[PDB]
Design a protein around this ligand. Structure first.
Ligand SMILES: C[C@H]1O[C@@H](O)[C@H](O)[C@@H](O)[C@@H]1O
Ligand SMILES: C[C@H]1O[C@@H](O)[C@H](O)[C@@H](O)[C@@H]1O
Ligand code: NA
Lengths: 346, 339
């Protein structure tokens, strides 16, 4: 079933319920996921109206871009040319600059395929917007099916050579309450290396480091508390995790990550090379979610994309997008029950 | 009464009905006027869904900008520096460039004041959008009252020196049908001068012309056919009217223009110095409105703004907007019925 209603300020809330009774909802404000519930329990973090997003935190669940992450000094090189993008974080360009895509009302159309329902959001980034050559015609399709798979498919075409590397900023919290730390969740992640940050400004350090056998090694499932309790320099620098993890094996076919809590698991699939993880290291900020004051470590992201810092570490990849070339990206979050035995206590 | 409904593609339709039974409707798609009707008759042109506007014509009733009109070669000088804006009509920049603010979904909030209802639309034009320095936080407030006054109030603030001169692109047609020419309407317009076009490119010619005692003199009410039948080269150039008229006296209190058809009349008030009039000179195009094929001369606009062409004719005024300065503009369309 499909339902639509005003969500505030002119945005709409599109709610889907699949045959299993699982419901998920999106808004055209930032082509964003707002909620995902199983049996009355929220699996992700979200607000109750559009204004909350604009007044509390505009990132949760959003589509962010055109480039996700930080670009040192907002400088990129496009076809031998240097371009400076909007710098909204000191001299850095963070998540595409100020008042970026996550803050706009996208147009959308809904396609009912029966076992699957797709919600295709569209937006055009005009040439020069925030310093980005364009125009860029973008589309983000969120779909949910009877198999409990929530899929995100990105498509884009530019009139000019530009850069493109968007992501989805959902935050999970299997506790269903932001005031409950995710340190009690089990995490499995197929990555042997990570990208350290230089310092508090959070630009990349310049090197790639092997994390096998460290408190950041999750190849084999472990509780998130292991990472949170770590005094490794990188953990201490950010007060949790806030780093790109390089996947060891690529392909949409492979389960790259799995987040578990008791009988529920979220599996992550993608065709991208890295997973940027941020564990809501907000300290005592306490942003209110459903009237619950969010705790430090009260959420975790799995931002699939080309790793940030390729400007400094070419080995990370290339986010350039050629004029007329079609960009595509696919990320999938699938929900399961009783995938494994996870009975722990915090 | 207020009624909000889905208008297509995620856009909304906000319909206001005053104490008089008059209904006016807007959409956040382009902070635009969709309909205006009395006793079941449409007074303006408009479509029945968001898709139509995107597929047929995106300008009708829209807020256009940041700069309304044509900019020769897309060139503007800002603080002594040349800036090239998006070019969407040949080398010209027309109505802010491609995929401009009229094709965006604006956020909005409705404020019910009883005798008056306001709908505030907001949009941020990012720095660099279509070549324009910014960012520019813009708001357009459309309001409707019990006195049948439809008012447009624009506000804007830019983080950097830029240019700004938006306008409302409603097309009136008192016949209430697109297949019927407005040649039968009477027009009065308090302007003794106009800005001639250079040629078919429609860029300004460079001069300011006195129109007193010509087919374009509407200082005294006259029928549109007059103009339409004129042999003035400027009329023949565009096959109608497609020009900036310079108001003789400025100020919001003065009725600057009046469009009449029988018992019905629309009065125009504004704090702007010029009124750009375009008479839908589309020829055989035949765009469909409510299933009715539009005819050449099937509509007429009153775009109040600073006249286009100031890039070449400085006397027309100046559209710059300095960082931190607050831009304001007001335009009112008043509906009257003879009794
Ligand atoms: C990946 C994350 O990095 C963090 O430092 C920012 O604060 C987040 O909003 C961001 O998305
Ligand atoms: C002033 C007018 O000039 C005309 O040529 C255009 O086609 C109109 O849409 C524009 O508003
Ligand atoms: Na809507």
């Amino acid at each position: 079933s499909i339902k639509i209603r005003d969500f505030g300020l002119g945005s709409d809330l599109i709610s889907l319920t699949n045959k299993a009774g699982v419901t998920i909802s999106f808004t055209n404000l930032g082509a964003r996921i707002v909620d995902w519930q199983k049996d009355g329990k929220h699996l992700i973090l979200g607000f109750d109206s559009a204004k909350e997003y604009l007044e509390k935190d505009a990132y949760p669940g959003a589509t962010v871009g055109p480039t996700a992450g930080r670009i040192k000094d907002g400088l990129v090189k496009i076809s031998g040319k240097d371009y400076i993008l909007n710098q909204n974080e000191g001299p850095q360009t963070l998540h595409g600059g100020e008042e970026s895509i996550h803050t706009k009302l996208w147009t959308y159309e809904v396609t009912d395929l029966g076992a699957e329902v797709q919600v295709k959001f569209s937006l055009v980034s005009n040439d020069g917007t925030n310093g980005y050559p364009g125009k860029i015609e973008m589309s983000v399709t969120h779909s949910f099916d009877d198999d409990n798979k929530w899929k995100i498919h990105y498509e884009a075409i530019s009139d000019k050579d530009t850069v493109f590397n968007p992501t989805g900023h959902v935050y999970f919290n299997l506790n269903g309450d932001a005031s409950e730390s995710v340190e009690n969740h089990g995490l499995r992640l197929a990555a042997s290396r990570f990208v350290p940050l230089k310092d508090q400004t959070e630009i990349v350090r310049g090197d790639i480091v092997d994390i096998k056998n460290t408190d950041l090694d999750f190849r084999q499932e472990k509780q998130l508390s292991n990472a949170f309790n770590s005094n490794m320099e990188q953990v201490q620098l950010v007060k949790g995790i806030d780093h790109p993890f390089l996947l060891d094996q690529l392909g949409l076919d492979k389960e790259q990550a799995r987040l578990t809590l008791d009988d529920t698991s979220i599996s992550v699939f993608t065709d991208q090379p890295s997973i940027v993880i941020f564990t809501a290291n907000f300290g005592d900020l306490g942003t209110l979610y459903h009237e619950k004051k969010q705790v430090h470590h009260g959420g975790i992201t799995f931002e699939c994309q080309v790793s940030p810092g390729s400007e400094q570490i070419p080995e990370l990849g290339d986010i350039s997008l050629k004029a007329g070339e079609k960009y595509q990206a696919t990320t999938i979050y699938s929900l399961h029950t009783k995938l494994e035995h996870h009975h722990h206590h915090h």
